[PDB]
Structure formats: C-alpha cells, structure tokens
Short mmCIF file of C-alpha atoms (C1' of nucleotides) and ligand atoms in Angstrom, two decimals:
data_model
loop_
_atom_site.label_atom_id
_atom_site.label_comp_id
_atom_site.label_asym_id
_atom_site.label_seq_id
_atom_site.Cartn_x
_atom_site.Cartn_y
_atom_site.Cartn_z
CA UNK A 1 203.38 79.59 50.99
CA UNK A 2 202.06 80.92 54.23
CA UNK A 3 203.76 83.74 55.79
CA UNK A 4 204.42 86.03 52.92
CA UNK A 5 208.01 85.25 52.32
CA UNK A 6 207.12 82.14 50.15
CA UNK A 7 204.59 84.23 48.09
CA UNK A 8 207.35 86.73 47.37
CA UNK A 9 209.60 83.93 46.22
CA UNK A 10 206.94 82.15 44.48
CA UNK A 11 207.94 81.38 40.65
CA UNK A 12 205.37 83.69 39.17
CA UNK A 13 206.44 86.66 41.11
CA UNK A 14 210.06 85.93 40.26
CA UNK A 15 209.00 85.72 36.57
CA UNK A 16 207.34 89.02 36.72
CA UNK A 17 210.37 90.55 38.34
CA UNK A 18 212.54 89.22 35.69
CA UNK A 19 210.15 90.54 32.95
CA UNK A 20 210.15 93.90 34.68
CA UNK A 21 214.08 93.79 34.85
CA UNK A 22 214.16 92.94 31.02
CA UNK A 23 211.83 95.69 30.04
CA UNK A 24 211.81 99.08 31.52
CA UNK A 25 214.69 98.44 34.25
CA UNK A 26 212.83 97.73 37.23
CA UNK A 27 215.05 95.86 39.68
CA UNK A 28 214.65 95.85 43.58
CA UNK A 29 218.19 95.93 44.88
CA UNK A 30 216.62 95.22 48.16
CA UNK A 31 215.53 91.95 46.93
CA UNK A 32 219.10 90.72 45.61
CA UNK A 33 221.86 90.39 48.13
CA UNK A 34 224.67 92.86 47.38
CA UNK A 35 227.87 91.55 45.79
CA UNK A 36 230.97 90.90 47.81
CA UNK A 37 233.64 91.77 45.17
CA UNK A 38 233.05 95.06 43.50
CA UNK A 39 234.86 95.77 40.34
CA UNK A 40 232.36 93.22 38.70
CA UNK A 41 229.87 96.08 38.12
CA UNK A 42 230.57 98.01 35.06
CA UNK A 43 227.42 100.14 35.39
CA UNK A 44 227.36 103.26 37.54
CA UNK A 45 223.68 103.08 38.30
CA UNK A 46 223.65 99.66 39.79
CA UNK A 47 226.72 100.59 41.91
CA UNK A 48 225.06 103.72 43.14
CA UNK A 49 221.90 101.46 44.21
CA UNK A 50 224.23 99.15 45.88
CA UNK A 51 225.82 101.91 47.84
CA UNK A 52 222.41 103.20 48.71
CA UNK A 53 221.26 99.81 50.02
CA UNK A 54 224.48 99.41 52.14
CA UNK A 55 223.94 102.93 53.54
CA UNK A 56 220.46 101.88 54.61
CA UNK A 57 221.60 98.76 56.12
CA UNK A 58 224.17 100.64 58.23
CA UNK A 59 221.52 102.93 59.26
CA UNK A 60 219.32 100.08 60.45
CA UNK A 61 222.05 98.60 62.36
CA UNK A 62 222.67 101.88 64.05
CA UNK A 63 219.09 102.36 64.83
CA UNK A 64 219.01 99.11 66.96
CA UNK A 65 222.40 99.19 68.55
CA UNK A 66 221.55 101.85 71.02
CA UNK A 67 218.91 99.75 72.77
CA UNK A 68 218.51 99.82 76.66
CA UNK A 69 219.87 96.30 77.43
CA UNK A 70 223.31 97.63 76.37
CA UNK A 71 225.28 94.84 78.12
CA UNK A 72 223.82 91.94 75.70
CA UNK A 73 226.22 90.51 73.41
CA UNK A 74 224.16 91.04 70.27
CA UNK A 75 224.80 94.63 70.45
CA UNK A 76 228.57 93.95 70.84
CA UNK A 77 228.41 91.72 67.74
CA UNK A 78 226.56 94.33 65.71
CA UNK A 79 229.37 96.81 66.48
CA UNK A 80 231.60 94.59 64.33
CA UNK A 81 228.86 94.20 61.92
CA UNK A 82 228.53 98.04 61.87
CA UNK A 83 232.10 98.40 61.06
CA UNK A 84 232.22 95.93 58.11
CA UNK A 85 229.13 97.81 56.76
CA UNK A 86 230.97 101.01 57.01
CA UNK A 87 233.98 99.40 55.12
CA UNK A 88 231.76 98.06 52.39
CA UNK A 89 230.40 101.69 52.13
CA UNK A 90 233.77 103.00 51.72
CA UNK A 91 234.79 100.31 49.33
CA UNK A 92 231.71 101.22 47.25
CA UNK A 93 233.06 104.74 47.16
CA UNK A 94 235.70 103.57 44.62
CA UNK A 95 237.55 106.38 42.27
CA UNK A 96 236.82 105.04 38.94
CA UNK A 97 234.21 107.66 38.49
CA UNK B 1 191.24 87.57 44.74
CA UNK B 2 189.93 84.99 47.10
CA UNK B 3 191.92 82.41 49.07
CA UNK B 4 190.29 79.23 47.15
CA UNK B 5 191.46 80.91 43.78
CA UNK B 6 191.45 78.14 40.96
CA UNK B 7 193.88 79.96 38.34
CA UNK B 8 196.37 82.48 38.72
CA UNK B 9 196.62 84.87 35.59
CA UNK B 10 199.52 84.31 33.36
CA UNK B 11 200.89 86.62 30.70
CA UNK B 12 200.18 85.70 27.18
CA UNK B 13 203.84 84.72 26.66
CA UNK B 14 204.59 82.34 29.66
CA UNK B 15 206.86 79.47 28.55
CA UNK B 16 206.56 77.59 31.93
CA UNK B 17 209.79 75.56 31.78
CA UNK B 18 211.71 78.68 30.60
CA UNK B 19 210.10 80.82 33.38
CA UNK B 20 211.23 78.24 35.84
CA UNK B 21 214.72 78.29 34.39
CA UNK B 22 214.76 82.09 34.64
CA UNK B 23 213.61 81.97 38.22
CA UNK B 24 216.41 79.39 39.04
CA UNK B 25 218.94 81.58 37.38
CA UNK B 26 217.72 84.41 39.65
CA UNK B 27 217.46 82.22 42.85
CA UNK B 28 221.04 82.11 43.40
CA UNK B 29 221.17 85.97 43.42
CA UNK B 30 217.90 86.28 45.44
CA UNK B 31 218.20 87.18 49.10
CA UNK B 32 215.31 85.14 50.65
CA UNK B 33 215.24 81.38 49.41
CA UNK B 34 219.09 81.54 49.39
CA UNK B 35 219.54 81.40 53.21
CA UNK B 36 219.05 79.38 56.41
CA UNK B 37 216.98 79.79 59.49
CA UNK B 38 213.39 80.10 57.55
CA UNK B 39 210.90 81.13 59.96
CA UNK B 40 208.14 78.99 61.60
CA UNK B 41 205.30 79.21 64.21
CA UNK B 42 205.66 76.62 66.99
CA UNK B 43 204.63 75.99 70.41
CA UNK B 44 207.21 74.58 73.06
CA UNK B 45 207.08 70.97 73.97
CA UNK B 46 209.98 71.09 76.47
CA UNK B 47 208.72 73.66 79.06
CA UNK B 48 212.18 75.01 79.97
CA UNK B 49 213.80 77.95 81.74
CA UNK B 50 215.79 80.63 79.48
CA UNK B 51 219.29 80.42 80.79
CA UNK B 52 220.21 84.08 80.77
CA UNK B 53 217.09 85.85 82.70
CA UNK B 54 215.54 82.63 84.12
CA UNK B 55 212.13 83.28 82.26
CA UNK B 56 210.03 80.08 82.78
CA UNK B 57 208.37 79.50 79.37
CA UNK B 58 205.83 76.79 80.10
CA UNK B 59 204.62 74.06 77.86
CA UNK B 60 202.67 74.79 74.75
CA UNK B 61 203.52 78.46 74.66
CA UNK B 62 203.59 79.70 71.05
CA UNK B 63 206.45 81.49 69.42
CA UNK B 64 207.67 82.51 65.94
CA UNK B 65 210.65 80.45 65.69
CA UNK B 66 213.50 79.79 62.99
CA UNK B 67 213.60 76.13 61.78
CA UNK B 68 217.02 75.25 60.14
CA UNK B 69 218.34 71.95 58.71
CA UNK B 70 221.06 70.24 60.64
CA UNK B 71 223.50 68.80 58.00
CA UNK B 72 224.45 65.84 60.34
CA UNK B 73 221.05 63.60 60.04
CA UNK B 74 219.80 60.88 62.49
CA UNK B 75 221.09 57.35 61.19
CA UNK B 76 220.59 57.92 57.35
CA UNK B 77 217.37 59.17 55.84
CA UNK B 78 215.41 60.85 58.55
CA UNK B 79 216.36 64.57 59.20
CA UNK B 80 216.61 66.40 62.16
CA UNK B 81 216.15 70.28 62.85
CA UNK B 82 217.16 73.16 65.11
CA UNK B 83 214.37 75.16 66.26
CA UNK B 84 215.28 78.64 67.46
CA UNK B 85 212.96 80.83 69.96
CA UNK B 86 213.63 83.82 71.92
CA UNK B 87 212.85 84.26 75.62
CA UNK B 88 210.01 86.73 76.21
CA UNK B 89 211.87 89.11 78.69
CA UNK B 90 215.57 88.83 77.65
CA UNK B 91 216.33 88.20 73.85
CA UNK B 92 218.57 85.26 74.30
CA UNK B 93 218.31 82.61 71.47
CA UNK B 94 216.93 79.54 72.85
CA UNK B 95 216.68 76.30 70.64
CA UNK B 96 216.29 72.72 70.47
CA UNK B 97 217.04 69.72 68.27
CA UNK B 98 214.43 66.79 67.44
CA UNK B 99 216.51 63.60 67.76
CA UNK B 100 213.86 60.94 66.90
CA UNK B 101 215.45 57.97 68.52
CA UNK B 102 213.67 58.62 71.67
CA UNK B 103 210.47 60.32 69.92
CA UNK B 104 211.43 63.50 71.58
CA UNK B 105 213.75 66.65 71.54
CA UNK B 106 217.22 67.71 72.81
CA UNK B 107 218.16 71.09 74.29
CA UNK B 108 220.64 73.01 72.30
CA UNK B 109 222.68 75.66 74.21
CA UNK B 110 219.48 77.60 75.07
CA UNK B 111 217.89 76.66 78.21
CA UNK B 112 217.31 73.55 80.38
CA UNK B 113 214.34 71.27 80.63
CA UNK B 114 212.47 70.86 84.11
CA UNK C 1 192.38 74.14 69.37
CA UNK C 2 195.28 73.24 71.86
CA UNK C 3 198.92 71.94 70.73
CA UNK C 4 199.80 73.43 67.63
CA UNK C 5 203.03 71.30 66.90
CA UNK C 6 201.01 68.32 66.30
CA UNK C 7 200.30 69.82 62.96
CA UNK C 8 203.87 70.23 61.95
CA UNK C 9 206.21 67.96 59.73
CA UNK C 10 209.16 68.71 61.95
CA UNK C 11 207.60 67.66 64.97
CA UNK C 12 208.96 64.00 65.88
CA UNK C 13 206.00 63.30 68.05
CA UNK C 14 203.71 63.67 64.87
CA UNK C 15 202.96 59.93 64.09
CA UNK C 16 203.82 59.91 60.40
CA UNK C 17 207.55 61.08 61.22
CA UNK C 18 207.64 58.34 63.92
CA UNK C 19 206.54 55.63 61.39
CA UNK C 20 208.99 56.85 59.11
CA UNK C 21 211.74 56.66 61.67
CA UNK C 22 210.66 53.20 62.62
CA UNK C 23 210.79 52.07 59.04
CA UNK C 24 214.28 53.56 58.63
CA UNK C 25 215.41 51.69 61.64
CA UNK C 26 213.72 48.41 60.52
CA UNK C 27 215.40 48.45 57.28
CA UNK C 28 218.72 49.40 58.74
CA UNK C 29 218.27 46.99 61.68
CA UNK C 30 217.51 44.26 59.23
CA UNK C 31 220.64 45.05 57.18
CA UNK C 32 222.85 45.07 60.38
CA UNK C 33 221.34 41.63 61.45
CA UNK C 34 222.27 40.20 57.97
CA UNK C 35 225.73 41.71 58.25
CA UNK C 36 226.02 40.77 61.97
CA UNK C 37 225.32 37.17 61.36
CA UNK C 38 227.93 37.00 58.62
CA UNK C 39 230.46 38.66 60.92
CA UNK C 40 229.79 36.18 63.50
CA UNK C 41 230.35 33.23 61.01
CA UNK C 42 233.53 34.77 59.96
CA UNK C 43 234.82 34.92 63.60
CA UNK C 44 233.73 31.35 64.10
CA UNK C 45 235.67 30.33 61.05
CA UNK C 46 238.72 32.17 62.15
CA UNK D 1 193.73 95.16 80.45
CA UNK D 2 191.98 96.99 77.50
CA UNK D 3 188.93 94.72 77.87
CA UNK D 4 187.30 97.74 79.45
CA UNK D 5 183.99 99.04 80.41
CA UNK D 6 182.73 102.48 79.60
CA UNK D 7 181.50 106.21 80.91
CA UNK D 8 179.65 107.70 78.25
CA UNK D 9 178.51 107.19 74.44
CA UNK D 10 178.37 110.16 71.66
CA UNK D 11 176.40 112.18 69.28
CA UNK D 12 178.41 114.22 66.67
CA UNK D 13 177.29 115.63 63.26
CA UNK D 14 179.46 115.47 60.14
CA UNK D 15 178.69 116.10 56.54
CA UNK D 16 176.28 113.40 55.16
CA UNK D 17 177.66 110.50 52.99
CA UNK D 18 175.03 110.27 50.20
CA UNK D 19 175.00 106.45 50.35
CA UNK D 20 172.03 104.61 49.13
CA UNK D 21 171.05 102.54 52.27
CA UNK D 22 168.67 99.59 51.55
CA UNK D 23 166.19 100.37 54.35
CA UNK D 24 166.08 104.25 53.80
CA UNK D 25 164.66 103.46 50.28
CA UNK D 26 161.15 104.64 49.89
CA UNK D 27 158.17 102.78 51.28
CA UNK D 28 154.93 103.63 52.79
CA UNK D 29 154.77 107.18 51.55
CA UNK D 30 151.08 107.39 52.43
CA UNK D 31 150.67 108.21 55.96
CA UNK D 32 147.31 107.17 57.58
CA UNK D 33 145.15 109.37 59.65
CA UNK D 34 142.30 109.18 62.35
CA UNK D 35 138.73 109.92 61.57
CA UNK D 36 138.03 113.34 63.36
"C1'" G E 1 199.65 137.49 121.79
"C1'" A E 2 201.38 137.05 116.42
"C1'" A E 3 204.99 134.62 112.11
"C1'" U E 4 206.99 130.12 110.81
"C1'" C E 5 208.91 125.07 110.63
"C1'" U E 6 208.95 119.55 112.49
"C1'" C E 7 206.27 115.17 114.16
"C1'" U E 8 201.79 112.28 115.60
"C1'" U E 9 196.17 111.18 115.00
"C1'" U E 10 191.16 111.95 112.42
"C1'" G E 11 188.93 113.36 108.14
"C1'" C E 12 190.30 113.03 102.75
"C1'" C E 13 193.05 108.84 100.63
"C1'" U E 14 193.64 103.16 94.28
"C1'" U E 15 192.99 99.60 104.02
"C1'" U E 16 194.01 97.84 96.29
"C1'" U E 17 190.88 96.25 90.45
"C1'" G E 18 187.15 100.11 84.25
"C1'" G E 19 182.68 95.07 80.42
"C1'" C E 20 179.80 90.66 78.67
"C1'" U E 21 179.49 85.38 77.22
"C1'" U E 22 178.52 77.87 77.92
"C1'" A E 23 182.98 79.89 85.74
"C1'" G E 24 183.74 82.23 77.77
"C1'" A E 25 186.12 77.26 76.45
"C1'" U E 26 190.11 73.42 77.69
"C1'" C E 27 194.38 71.57 80.77
"C1'" A E 28 193.19 66.20 76.62
"C1'" A E 29 194.05 64.26 70.60
"C1'" G E 30 198.03 58.23 65.71
"C1'" U E 31 194.54 63.71 65.10
"C1'" G E 32 191.32 65.04 61.18
"C1'" U E 33 190.36 69.04 58.35
"C1'" A E 34 190.84 72.69 54.83
"C1'" G E 35 194.26 75.75 52.15
"C1'" U E 36 199.10 77.65 50.17
"C1'" A E 37 204.04 76.88 47.91
"C1'" U E 38 208.91 74.47 44.55
"C1'" C E 39 213.95 71.71 44.38
"C1'" U E 40 219.92 68.74 43.20
"C1'" G E 41 224.88 69.51 41.52
"C1'" U E 42 229.03 70.18 37.72
"C1'" U E 43 231.44 73.75 34.51
"C1'" C E 44 233.27 77.65 30.08
"C1'" U E 45 236.56 81.82 29.45
"C1'" U E 46 257.93 84.36 17.20
"C1'" G E 47 262.94 86.53 17.41
"C1'" U E 48 267.26 89.74 15.00
"C1'" A E 49 268.85 93.77 11.61
"C1'" A E 50 268.26 97.82 8.38
"C1'" C E 51 265.33 102.09 6.27
"C1'" A E 52 260.87 105.95 6.61
"C1'" A E 53 258.55 108.94 11.63
"C1'" C E 54 258.31 111.23 16.48
"C1'" U E 55 261.68 112.76 21.28
"C1'" G E 56 257.56 112.60 25.62
"C1'" A E 57 252.72 112.05 28.49
"C1'" A E 58 249.46 113.08 32.56
"C1'" A E 59 247.91 116.15 36.72
"C1'" U E 60 246.04 120.63 39.14
"C1'" G E 61 248.00 125.70 40.21
"C1'" A E 62 250.45 130.40 38.55
"C1'" C E 63 249.07 134.88 33.14
"C1'" C E 64 244.96 137.36 30.03
"C1'" U E 65 239.38 137.82 28.43
"C1'" A E 66 234.56 128.43 28.68
"C1'" G E 67 238.96 129.81 25.43
"C1'" G E 68 244.42 130.99 24.31
"C1'" C E 69 250.17 130.23 24.84
"C1'" U E 70 254.22 129.63 28.78
"C1'" C E 71 256.17 127.24 33.52
"C1'" G F 1 191.17 81.50 58.07
"C1'" U F 2 197.82 81.50 56.02
"C1'" A F 3 198.26 87.30 61.63
"C1'" U F 4 201.15 91.25 62.24
"C1'" G F 5 203.96 95.71 63.20
"C1'" U F 6 208.21 99.36 63.18
"C1'" C F 7 212.52 100.18 59.70
"C1'" U F 8 213.49 103.28 53.75
"C1'" A F 9 217.39 110.99 52.70
"C1'" A F 10 216.17 112.22 46.51
"C1'" A F 11 230.12 87.51 35.25
"C1'" U F 12 228.25 84.83 30.89
"C1'" G F 13 225.71 80.76 28.93
"C1'" C F 14 225.95 75.28 29.85
"C1'" U F 15 223.52 71.38 31.45
"C1'" C F 16 222.58 67.50 34.74
"C1'" U F 17 219.16 65.43 39.02
"C1'" U F 18 213.60 63.24 40.20
"C1'" A F 19 208.37 56.96 41.60
"C1'" U F 20 209.41 63.24 47.39
"C1'" U F 21 208.53 68.15 50.95
"C1'" U F 22 214.65 71.64 55.09
"C1'" A F 23 207.78 72.45 52.56
"C1'" C F 24 204.63 76.31 55.04
"C1'" U F 25 199.50 77.61 57.31
"C1'" A F 26 196.86 76.66 61.60
"C1'" A F 27 192.38 81.04 62.43
"C1'" C F 28 188.66 75.35 61.68
"C1'" A F 29 186.56 70.72 64.15
"C1'" A F 30 187.13 66.90 67.42
"C1'" A F 31 183.49 59.92 68.46
"C1'" A F 32 183.03 54.81 68.94
"C1'" U F 33 181.70 48.80 68.57
"C1'" U G 1 132.82 38.95 33.06
"C1'" A G 2 136.65 43.26 35.76
"C1'" A G 3 144.16 43.80 37.58
"C1'" G G 4 148.84 46.71 35.86
"C1'" U G 5 147.48 55.13 33.76
"C1'" G G 6 149.60 59.09 35.58
"C1'" A G 7 152.03 62.75 41.00
"C1'" U G 8 159.68 62.86 40.61
"C1'" C G 9 162.40 68.15 46.33
"C1'" U G 10 167.01 69.26 45.23
"C1'" A G 11 171.05 72.05 42.21
"C1'" G G 12 176.71 77.25 44.52
"C1'" A G 13 180.23 81.51 45.87
"C1'" A G 14 182.53 84.79 49.50
"C1'" A G 15 183.98 85.86 54.04
"C1'" G G 16 184.35 83.81 58.66
MG1 LIG H 201 186.16 86.28 63.75
#
RNA sequence: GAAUCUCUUUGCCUUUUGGCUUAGAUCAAGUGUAGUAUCUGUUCUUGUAACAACUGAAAUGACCUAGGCUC
RNA sequence: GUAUGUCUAAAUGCUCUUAUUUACUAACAAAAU
RNA sequence: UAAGUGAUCUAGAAAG
C-alpha cells in the first residue's frame, strides 16, 4: 500500500470511518463521490455538505483554468466541466427547503 | 509506529468478516478504489518524443504515471496495460501499452519512438 | 540502482511476466495444434 | 543550482533552551593547579 | 568662450559560472532484497345507489397594535 | 526506506465468487565454476 | 605395576 491512497482505502481505515459515521456522525464528504440524482437525500445536512463539496470543486476548477498555456485543450475541456459543476450546484439549490 | 510493525491495533469489537463486509458496502460509494488510472512510478523504456512540444524524453527517465487496465487482453489470460506519462515542458498526456507478443511496448497516441 | 521498471509487475521485459506469456502461448499453441490436425483430417476426408 | 558555496558563518544569541545535554553533565569539578 | 545632445574608443564591465566526495557513482542486471496492501457478480421493493356533514384551499401584499378580521 | 508539494469561505438489505495480484514501493544491494 | 577429570564466545530494535 505504498503512495498513501492504498493506506487510506485500507480495510482498517474504512472500518474506522464506518464506526465514526455510526457513532457521532463523522462523515467525510470529500471521501465519497457526490451522488448523481438528487432527491435521494432526505436529510438537509447531507445535502448542504454535498453542495459545499461541489462549490469547492468548482473553485478548484476555476483556479486552474486561468493558467498561462491557455491554448491547450485541457483548459477548453474544463470550461465544459466548469459549466457542468455550475449546473450541479444549481440543482443542489433545489426548493424543497 | 515503525515500518516493520508486526500487529496493528484493532478495537475490542472487530468482527473481521463483518468489517470486511462493511468496507465492501462502503467501497462502491468510495471515491478512490472505485476509479481507473491508479498512479504508478515508472521509468520510460521507449525513449521517445512528446508529439506536441517535441521534448525528447530519453530512456530510463522517471515519471509518476497512471497505470490503467486495458479490457481487451492479449490472447486470453495475460493482461496488458496503458501507462500514462506527461511531457516535462508541455502537459500532453503521452502513454503506451505493453503488448507481450514481442516482449516490448506499443505507443498509444502520445509520442513516437526513436 | 539504475532501471526501475525492472521491479514492476506490469513491465513485460520482467522475466516472470515473459515466462507466463510463454506458458499461455504454449498451452494455447498446443490446443491449436490439436485442433489444427483435426481440421486437416476433416478437410482430407471431405 | 543551489549546491552552493558560502560567504560567512553566524553568531546570534537567543533565550537558552534548558535541555540536559549528555556532555554538559558535571565532571572534573576539581581544577588542578601549579605549585607556586 | 559657455549650455546641451548624438556617435566612436579606453577605463569600468557576469571578453561568461557561488561548495565537497571513490572524474561522487553508473551508462550494465532472468535481477535479488526488503517491506506495504485486498477482490468477482446478481437482485428485492372493487363498482353503483341512498342517507348524515361541508361548499372550498394556498400564496404574498393592502388595515390596526408576533397577534386580530376583511379583500 | 514506500518521497513530496499546492488546493479547502463558516436507497435498503440480499447473497454469490476464490488452489491468485489491474497489487503497490523501490530509497537498499549487485558474483561465478 | 601407571591411560580415559575438568576449561563451552554468542544472544536484538529503530532509523538509514
Ligand atoms: Mg540518507
């Protein structure tokens, strides 16, 4: 399990995380992938967390896309990615509450 | 606390099978582990030119690549891999495949061998 | 040390991998031969 | 590169640490003297 | 004679460099050696009539000092 | 000797697969009769 | 006529 990722997703760590989730309510919304279809999330806190995560992602995307080699295609691709992120964020701002 | 550590501490209630099951349940949800292009450190055997900016990355030069499994295996039961690299100057994704018929590699829309 | 790749699984130039490949070929090759002969026989019969 | 030679050393006084160095431990408290 | 500006040469300028080590080591190797880590799919989610009762909800804004009626 | 750095506003249970590993790390060391 | 007594080092952990 060299290079840290393996360590992170080693069974023991996972178990610990699960335990934390069970007792006290420590989740790491960084750690899990954000769900595709909203309205399968009855809790508000979770939703908020997800929204926050997406915002963070968007910010990250923004930070990188103004790099100096602007003509490279990665940046262009991200522009679409950025849009997608924005859309997701908007969706997360649903009007149930 | 020391790299050759014999026994990692477990909680007093740790049903190992149960724990494993739990992990599995929370592996589909997991971000890492449920993805492709897992990282790797590799030297470059081909000694090739980055097709965008013509940067002549020579033999044995070290990179933090991404190894990914190619679903279409060679013959039957011997896997082949895509091994992504970036050129030093321009950030173009070079990669290569390991077709073991010739005991060597194949370039994959990254650069050219010379 | 020098060449790193030599201490990797994925590296085909690693000897173990090569051996495995050979084994695969050898088995498969044998099978083909077995079938090939049969095919030939069939053709002859025809 | 940064593999670099040099121009001068240093000597700047801070507050003492209060650490029990091994060598600093007492030893040869008695100073000798000459005859006169 | 004095003021200034432009060009050339000399002086002054990075007419080129901020360590040491076995030129630091090697342009070779079925490697060996130590360590660190766990996985494959497939699925569960009665009508009709009569009698008793109500005729209508929600939004924010117009009055008065969160509450009270009207539109 | 398993490098590192930046980046952070305050669906539920179910089971079935194994005589394995898309395993990763190379800082460590390098010869013949 | 007399052999064959005794001398007994060690001892693992980290980092590199
Ligand atoms: Mg060192």
